Design an enzyme around this catalytic site. Structure first.
Site, PDB file in Angstrom:
ATOM      1  N   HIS A  65       0.792  -1.100   0.053  1.00 50.71           N
ATOM      2  CA  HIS A  65      -0.145  -0.321   0.107  1.00 50.71           C
ATOM      3  C   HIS A  65       0.773   1.724   0.105  1.00 50.71           C
ATOM      4  O   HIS A  65       2.042   1.219   1.124  1.00 50.71           O
ATOM      5  CB  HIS A  65      -0.750  -0.121   1.701  1.00 50.71           C
ATOM      6  CG  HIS A  65      -2.327   1.810   1.142  1.00 50.71           C
ATOM      7  ND1 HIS A  65      -3.113   1.738   0.885  1.00 50.71           N
ATOM      8  CD2 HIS A  65      -1.372   2.384   2.534  1.00 50.71           C
ATOM      9  CE1 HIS A  65      -3.231   3.032   1.325  1.00 50.71           C
ATOM     10  NE2 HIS A  65      -3.072   2.846   2.350  1.00 50.71           N
ATOM     11  N   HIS A  67       0.511   5.172   1.063  1.00 42.38           N
ATOM     12  CA  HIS A  67      -0.448   5.254   2.055  1.00 42.38           C
ATOM     13  C   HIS A  67      -0.660   6.770   1.712  1.00 42.38           C
ATOM     14  O   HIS A  67       0.750   8.005   1.654  1.00 42.38           O
ATOM     15  CB  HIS A  67      -0.152   4.852   3.365  1.00 42.38           C
ATOM     16  CG  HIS A  67      -0.425   5.657   4.307  1.00 42.38           C
ATOM     17  ND1 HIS A  67      -0.724   5.031   6.116  1.00 42.38           N
ATOM     18  CD2 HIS A  67      -0.678   6.987   4.397  1.00 42.38           C
ATOM     19  CE1 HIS A  67      -1.369   5.826   6.207  1.00 42.38           C
ATOM     20  NE2 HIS A  67      -1.235   6.889   6.420  1.00 42.38           N
ATOM     21  N   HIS A 110       3.758   0.625   2.281  1.00 47.04           N
ATOM     22  CA  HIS A 110       4.440  -0.678   3.949  1.00 47.04           C
ATOM     23  C   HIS A 110       3.726  -2.256   3.178  1.00 47.04           C
ATOM     24  O   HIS A 110       2.609  -1.506   1.974  1.00 47.04           O
ATOM     25  CB  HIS A 110       3.799  -0.413   5.133  1.00 47.04           C
ATOM     26  CG  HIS A 110       2.701   0.203   5.073  1.00 47.04           C
ATOM     27  ND1 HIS A 110       0.656  -0.908   5.615  1.00 47.04           N
ATOM     28  CD2 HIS A 110       2.024   1.555   4.910  1.00 47.04           C
ATOM     29  CE1 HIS A 110       0.149  -0.296   5.209  1.00 47.04           C
ATOM     30  NE2 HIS A 110       0.681   1.165   5.110  1.00 47.04           N
ATOM     31  N   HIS A 112       0.946  -4.606   3.126  1.00 50.34           N
ATOM     32  CA  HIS A 112      -0.764  -4.505   3.689  1.00 50.34           C
ATOM     33  C   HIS A 112      -1.150  -5.999   3.634  1.00 50.34           C
ATOM     34  O   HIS A 112      -2.392  -5.657   3.622  1.00 50.34           O
ATOM     35  CB  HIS A 112      -1.434  -3.496   3.288  1.00 50.34           C
ATOM     36  CG  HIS A 112      -2.431  -2.702   3.350  1.00 50.34           C
ATOM     37  ND1 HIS A 112      -3.236  -2.792   4.270  1.00 50.34           N
ATOM     38  CD2 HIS A 112      -2.583  -1.318   3.680  1.00 50.34           C
ATOM     39  CE1 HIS A 112      -4.587  -2.494   4.920  1.00 50.34           C
ATOM     40  NE2 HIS A 112      -4.153  -1.694   4.454  1.00 50.34           N
ATOM     41  N   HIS A 397      -6.008   4.584  20.033  1.00 50.42           N
ATOM     42  CA  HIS A 397      -6.446   4.176  18.430  1.00 50.42           C
ATOM     43  C   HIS A 397      -6.247   5.021  17.107  1.00 50.42           C
ATOM     44  O   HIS A 397      -7.387   6.559  16.959  1.00 50.42           O
ATOM     45  CB  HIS A 397      -7.545   4.056  18.118  1.00 50.42           C
ATOM     46  CG  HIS A 397      -7.761   2.399  19.063  1.00 50.42           C
ATOM     47  ND1 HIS A 397      -6.993   1.409  19.001  1.00 50.42           N
ATOM     48  CD2 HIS A 397      -8.737   2.593  20.368  1.00 50.42           C
ATOM     49  CE1 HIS A 397      -7.675   0.451  20.155  1.00 50.42           C
ATOM     50  NE2 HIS A 397      -8.617   1.129  20.881  1.00 50.42           N
ATOM     51  N   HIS A 400      -7.635   5.411  10.083  1.00 49.54           N
ATOM     52  CA  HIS A 400      -6.446   5.617   8.651  1.00 49.54           C
ATOM     53  C   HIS A 400      -8.126   5.367   7.971  1.00 49.54           C
ATOM     54  O   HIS A 400      -8.259   4.332   7.711  1.00 49.54           O
ATOM     55  CB  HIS A 400      -5.486   5.125   8.228  1.00 49.54           C
ATOM     56  CG  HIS A 400      -5.093   5.123   6.341  1.00 49.54           C
ATOM     57  ND1 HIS A 400      -4.824   6.165   6.054  1.00 49.54           N
ATOM     58  CD2 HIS A 400      -4.928   4.417   6.430  1.00 49.54           C
ATOM     59  CE1 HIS A 400      -4.982   6.646   4.771  1.00 49.54           C
ATOM     60  NE2 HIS A 400      -4.103   5.491   5.330  1.00 49.54           N
ATOM     61  N   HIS A 402      -8.322   4.772   3.606  1.00 52.46           N
ATOM     62  CA  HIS A 402      -7.891   4.973   1.882  1.00 52.46           C
ATOM     63  C   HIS A 402      -8.279   6.093   1.260  1.00 52.46           C
ATOM     64  O   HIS A 402     -10.078   6.177   1.565  1.00 52.46           O
ATOM     65  CB  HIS A 402      -7.790   3.782   2.057  1.00 52.46           C
ATOM     66  CG  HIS A 402      -7.130   2.625   2.495  1.00 52.46           C
ATOM     67  ND1 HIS A 402      -6.390   1.225   2.012  1.00 52.46           N
ATOM     68  CD2 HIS A 402      -6.603   1.997   4.053  1.00 52.46           C
ATOM     69  CE1 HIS A 402      -5.302   1.016   2.388  1.00 52.46           C
ATOM     70  NE2 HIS A 402      -5.412   1.241   3.905  1.00 52.46           N
ATOM     71  N   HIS A 452      -9.650   2.119   8.891  1.00 53.06           N
ATOM     72  CA  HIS A 452      -8.598   1.083   9.737  1.00 53.06           C
ATOM     73  C   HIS A 452      -8.519   1.426  11.184  1.00 53.06           C
ATOM     74  O   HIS A 452      -7.734   2.709  10.935  1.00 53.06           O
ATOM     75  CB  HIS A 452      -8.585  -0.465   9.597  1.00 53.06           C
ATOM     76  CG  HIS A 452      -7.260   0.149   8.805  1.00 53.06           C
ATOM     77  ND1 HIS A 452      -6.060  -0.187   8.874  1.00 53.06           N
ATOM     78  CD2 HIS A 452      -6.567  -0.114   7.182  1.00 53.06           C
ATOM     79  CE1 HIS A 452      -5.513   0.772   8.695  1.00 53.06           C
ATOM     80  NE2 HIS A 452      -6.253   0.702   7.424  1.00 53.06           N
ATOM     81  N   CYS A 453      -7.816   0.980  12.425  1.00 49.13           N
ATOM     82  CA  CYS A 453      -7.335   1.523  13.528  1.00 49.13           C
ATOM     83  C   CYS A 453      -5.717   1.155  13.029  1.00 49.13           C
ATOM     84  O   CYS A 453      -5.245   0.038  12.104  1.00 49.13           O
ATOM     85  CB  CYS A 453      -7.546   0.709  14.502  1.00 49.13           C
ATOM     86  SG  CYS A 453      -6.288   1.204  15.677  1.00 49.13           S
ATOM     87  N   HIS A 454      -4.798   2.136  12.306  1.00 45.75           N
ATOM     88  CA  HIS A 454      -3.371   1.829  11.860  1.00 45.75           C
ATOM     89  C   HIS A 454      -2.664   0.915  13.254  1.00 45.75           C
ATOM     90  O   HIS A 454      -1.205   1.298  12.486  1.00 45.75           O
ATOM     91  CB  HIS A 454      -2.853   3.169  11.539  1.00 45.75           C
ATOM     92  CG  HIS A 454      -1.734   3.035  10.562  1.00 45.75           C
ATOM     93  ND1 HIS A 454      -1.259   1.559  10.091  1.00 45.75           N
ATOM     94  CD2 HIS A 454      -2.666   3.457   8.621  1.00 45.75           C
ATOM     95  CE1 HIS A 454      -0.269   1.930   8.907  1.00 45.75           C
ATOM     96  NE2 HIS A 454      -1.392   2.515   8.058  1.00 45.75           N
ATOM     97  N   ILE A 455      -3.442   0.817  14.698  1.00 46.82           N
ATOM     98  CA  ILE A 455      -2.433   0.074  15.108  1.00 46.82           C
ATOM     99  C   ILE A 455      -2.190  -1.344  14.616  1.00 46.82           C
ATOM    100  O   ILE A 455      -3.593  -1.462  14.514  1.00 46.82           O
ATOM    101  CB  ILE A 455      -2.396  -0.483  16.462  1.00 46.82           C
ATOM    102  CG1 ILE A 455      -1.925   1.482  17.118  1.00 46.82           C
ATOM    103  CG2 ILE A 455      -2.100  -0.986  17.070  1.00 46.82           C
ATOM    104  CD1 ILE A 455      -2.786   1.908  18.389  1.00 46.82           C
ATOM    105  N   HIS A 458      -4.086  -4.447  15.772  1.00 44.59           N
ATOM    106  CA  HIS A 458      -5.405  -4.071  15.748  1.00 44.59           C
ATOM    107  C   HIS A 458      -5.863  -4.579  14.619  1.00 44.59           C
ATOM    108  O   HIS A 458      -7.103  -4.798  14.854  1.00 44.59           O
ATOM    109  CB  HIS A 458      -5.869  -2.844  16.111  1.00 44.59           C
ATOM    110  CG  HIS A 458      -5.344  -2.460  17.806  1.00 44.59           C
ATOM    111  ND1 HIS A 458      -5.673  -0.737  18.316  1.00 44.59           N
ATOM    112  CD2 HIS A 458      -4.663  -3.178  18.549  1.00 44.59           C
ATOM    113  CE1 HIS A 458      -5.192  -1.119  19.665  1.00 44.59           C
ATOM    114  NE2 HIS A 458      -4.492  -2.368  19.613  1.00 44.59           N
ATOM    115  N   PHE A 463     -10.284  -4.197  14.192  1.00 44.31           N
ATOM    116  CA  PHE A 463     -10.719  -3.267  13.994  1.00 44.31           C
ATOM    117  C   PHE A 463     -10.839  -2.400  12.141  1.00 44.31           C
ATOM    118  O   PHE A 463     -10.295  -1.203  12.173  1.00 44.31           O
ATOM    119  CB  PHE A 463      -9.681  -2.715  14.940  1.00 44.31           C
ATOM    120  CG  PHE A 463     -10.379  -1.645  15.861  1.00 44.31           C
ATOM    121  CD1 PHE A 463     -11.728  -1.292  15.779  1.00 44.31           C
ATOM    122  CD2 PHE A 463      -9.704  -1.031  16.516  1.00 44.31           C
ATOM    123  CE1 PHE A 463     -12.494  -0.563  16.447  1.00 44.31           C
ATOM    124  CE2 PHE A 463     -10.253   0.247  17.459  1.00 44.31           C
ATOM    125  CZ  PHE A 463     -11.708   0.262  17.706  1.00 44.31           C
TER     126      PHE A 463
HETATM  127 CU   LIG Z   1      -6.535   0.174  17.526  1.00 44.52          CU
HETATM  128 CU   LIG Z   2      -0.411   2.926   6.388  1.00 45.27          CU
HETATM  129 CU   LIG Z   3      -3.757   4.093   3.769  1.00 49.59          CU
HETATM  130 CU   LIG Z   4      -4.715   0.255   4.807  1.00 53.61          CU
END
Ligand SMILES: [Cu+2]
Ligand SMILES: [Cu+2]
Ligand SMILES: [Cu+2]
Ligand SMILES: [Cu+2]
Ligand SMILES: *[C@@H]1O[C@H](CO)[C@@H](O[C@@H]2O[C@H](CO)[C@@H](O)[C@H](O)[C@H]2NC(C)=O)[C@H](O)[C@H]1NC(C)=O
Ligand SMILES: *[C@@H]1O[C@H](CO)[C@@H](O[C@@H]2O[C@H](CO)[C@@H](O)[C@H](O)[C@H]2NC(C)=O)[C@H](O)[C@H]1NC(C)=O
Ligand code: NA
Length: 499
Positions: A65, A67, A110, A112, A397, A400, A402, A452-455, A458, A463
């Protein structure tokens, strides 16, 4: 050197020791972090990703991905596995061929797939602006002014229990740092500056989980960009940066020639700076080659507060100036129990057929799409509001979206909304118990966009949801190359999956 906008990118396994402890990794371009991919605003990027992975302990499939890049008309190139593509299998390659109209700023790339980016597949992605409105604020802006902040683990990602409070073993700044336990005096990163010059420092969180309290002893930092969006100048002495966020700040090399600690304190893992953990070195040309002797203050008197940020351009806020004042106002119920996260009562588990392929095959409402309950349709050309009330365990949290950036109408730790001039960004902390962080955007980009949460731990624990934006126009807006159509047959054949 930077690579791109047209380049190959090999994904391999190798041993690395960024904190003095050796472990195998998943690497782009043979390094951690990966090489910087760069071009100019509006360029055609063609990143041909060669999957050369052989170690099953970190997964031999991959997907990448880009980002923060909107991918308008190229949803198929966005990278989230099982949302916009099936993974690339080992010994194959795939050309992510897209354009970056109307964007310029600091991004990253990164893996994905699953938690694979934790195992090392992460690097910077910069889209320069030849007519940058902030160009006169600094003298130097190049690969030497990118600063990455990363969490690093001695345990391989696929051995991290799902839904656990997973903790790192080192903070890495520009790929180097010291381990929290069994600390050894392994090499620290050095950022070199020339007395009197002004630098555009591009601060990139490549974290899989922690947020960092980032500061530079003796210096302040003048923010001029937030997640790709130019800001008014805001001077601070500390930046709390959540996973996946980016800032540009001007560093004025206006202190005496010498050595100064760069500090990045994570919210979990090692606390403080003993033995040089959580640290890097700012060195002026002409300084002695030795560690800094500087001290942090006990408290930071001008920390970043997100509501202080405002766009450089007059971006405003879409919709009407009150809660629910949008064409499509949503409130997500965000929860955690028993090792699994959920959104609106449903924990995300990736489907067998990628969402985009389901839509191109004729599934045309969100109730026909899999996973059932994990896909929300958005209408076209409409103002969307999404409230994200916090309280779920494991916070704060960083959510993010897309395909978009968004106005941050309400930020963490402050109950007051801003319908006039809030910052726009792509990853936002939803804060703490009782907060009601809220975002707005307009739907002008047909396709399935992950939220989604970007942790990353998670996300793996569920999440997430998919916004199927403008289902009816997705196929006409996003023509797909044959190589993309080939991915799911190849992947399913290799994994003995039927579909
Ligand atoms: Cu999270
Ligand atoms: Cu990302
Ligand atoms: Cu993204
Ligand atoms: Cu993503
Ligand atoms: C966050 O803000 C949303 C609106 O953006 C609130 O949503 C309302 O919730 C109440 C019940 O709690 C409903 O009666 C309304 O239909 C919702 N939409 C509105 C008023 O526009 C939500 O309650 C807020 N959450 C928190 C924790 O403050
Ligand atoms: C809480 O958030 C609000 C809204 O973003 C901030 O209120 C703004 O404060 C600025 C700076 O004084 C004023 O110019 C704006 O008119 C305010 N807007 C609104 C809608 O009230 C407020 O400053 C933030 N609180 C803290 C402590 O930073
Ligand atoms: Na407006």
């Amino acid at each position: 050197a930077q690579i791109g906008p047209v380049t190959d990118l090999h994904i391999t396994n190798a041993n690395i020791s960024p904190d003095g402890f050796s472990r195998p990794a998943v690497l782009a371009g043979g390094t951690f972090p990966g090489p910087t991919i760069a071009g100019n605003t509006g360029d055609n990027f063609q990143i041909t990703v060669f999957n050369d992975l052989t170690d099953p302990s970190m997964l031999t499939d991959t997907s990448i991905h880009w980002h923060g890049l909107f991918q308008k008309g190229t949803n198929w190139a966005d990278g989230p596995a099982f949302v916009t593509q099936c993974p690339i299998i080992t010994g194959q390659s795939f050309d992510y061929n897209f354009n970056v109209p109307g964007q310029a700023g600091t991004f990253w790339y990164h893996s994905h797939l699953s938690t694979q980016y934790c195992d090392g597949l992460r690097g910077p992605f910069v889209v320069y602006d030849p007519n940058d409105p902030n160009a006169s604020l600094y003298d130097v802006d190049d690969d030497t002014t990118i600063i990455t902040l990363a969490d690093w683990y001695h345990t391989l990602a696929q051995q991290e229990p799902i839904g656990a409070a997973i903790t790192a073993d080192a903070t890495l700044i520009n790929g180097l740092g010291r381990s929290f336990t069994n600390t050894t005096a392994s090499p620290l990163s050095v950022i070199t500056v020339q007395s009197g010059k002004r630098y555009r420092m591009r601060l990139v969180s490549i974290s899989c989980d922690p947020n960092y309290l980032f500061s530079i002893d003796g210096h302040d930092m003048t923010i001029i960009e937030v997640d790709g969006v130019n800001s008014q100048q805001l001077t601070v002495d500390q930046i709390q940066i959540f996973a996946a966020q980016r800032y540009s700040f001007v560093l004025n090399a206006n202190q005496p020639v010498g050595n100064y600690w760069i500090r990045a304190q994570p919210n979990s893992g090692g606390q403080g700076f003993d033995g040089g953990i959580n640290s890097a070195i700012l060195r002026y040309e002409g300084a002695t080659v030795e560690d800094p002797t500087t001290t942090a203050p006990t408290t930071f008197s001008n920390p970043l507060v997100e509501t202080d940020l405002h766009p450089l351009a007059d971006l405003g806020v879409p919709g009407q100036p009150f809660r629910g004042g949008a064409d499509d106002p949503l409130v997500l119920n965000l929860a955690f129990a028993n090792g699994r996260f959920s959104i609106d009562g449903v924990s995300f588990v990736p489907p067998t057929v990628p969402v985009l392929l389901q839509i191109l095959s004729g599934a045309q409402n969100a109730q026909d799409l899999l996973p059932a309950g994990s896909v929300i349709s958005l209408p076209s050309n409409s103002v969307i509001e999404v409230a994200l009330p916090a309280g779920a365990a494991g916070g704060p949290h960083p959510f993010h979206l897309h395909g978009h950036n968004f106005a941050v109408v309400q930020s963490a730790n402050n109950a007051t909304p801003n319908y006039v001039n809030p910052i726009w960004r792509d990853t936002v902390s939803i804060g703490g118990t009782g907060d009601n962080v809220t975002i707005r955007f307009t739907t002008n980009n047909p396709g399935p966009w992950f939220l989604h949460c970007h942790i990353d731990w998670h996300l793996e624990a569920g999440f997430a949801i998919v916004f199927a934006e403008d289902i009816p126009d997705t196929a006409s807006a996003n023509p797909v190359p044959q190589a993309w159509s080939d991915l799911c047959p190849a992947y399913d054949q290799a994994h003995n999956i039927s579909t």
